[PDB]
Amino acid sequence: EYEDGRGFGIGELVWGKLRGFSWWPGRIVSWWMTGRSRAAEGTRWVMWFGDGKFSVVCVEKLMPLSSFCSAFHQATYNKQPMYRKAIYEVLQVASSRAGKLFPAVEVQNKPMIEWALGGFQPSGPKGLEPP
């Protein structure tokens, strides 16, 4: 599965872009997790954080989580509680992988967002990879 040389393999935390919606946090899953069928070449199944919906997304509309500064939209964050939830979730998962520890969603998000914005120090983007 996904051996087409386009990257974004299973378990990778990503930003995904559908028409009519902001870049949204998700993770790449296998097709059998979706309760659907195989994705076409050059596309991936992503499970969105926030509500856990599944979508087929072309790799051209995917960015790694590390592209946080380009994808993160402050206006969306302010107005959409599910976006704050999605940010919370993807960064909880990311920080667990990187071994980045932090000392209700809006509160806990701030150090995690700062971490993301600062280049995911000390691990960098490498710490965000599936174990």
Architecture of domain 66-129: Orthogonal Bundle (1.10)
Amino acid at 54: F
Query: What CATH class does 1-65 carry?
Result: mainly beta
Let me know how long the chain is: 131
- Torsion sign over Cα 22, 45, 86, 82: positive
Torsions phi, psi for 90 (to 5 deg): -65, -35
Solved how?
X-ray
For residue 122 the two structure tokens come to 């000390």
Q: Are 89 and 61 in contact (CB under 8 A)?
A: no
Sheet holding 24-29, edge to edge: 54-58, 43-48, 24-29, 13-16, 62-64
Is omega for the bond preceding 25 within 30 degrees of 0, making it cis? no
- Per domain, the residue ranges of the chain are 1-65, 66-129
Resolution of this structure in Å: 2.3
Q: Write the CB contacts of 62 (distance below 8 Å, at least 6 apart in sequence).
A: 8, 14, 15, 16, 17, 44, 46
Q: Write the CB contacts of 115 (distance below 8 Å, at least 6 apart in sequence).
A: 91, 95, 100, 102, 121
Alpha carbon 104 to chain centroid distance?
21
Closest CA to 71 of 9, 130, 13, 131: 13
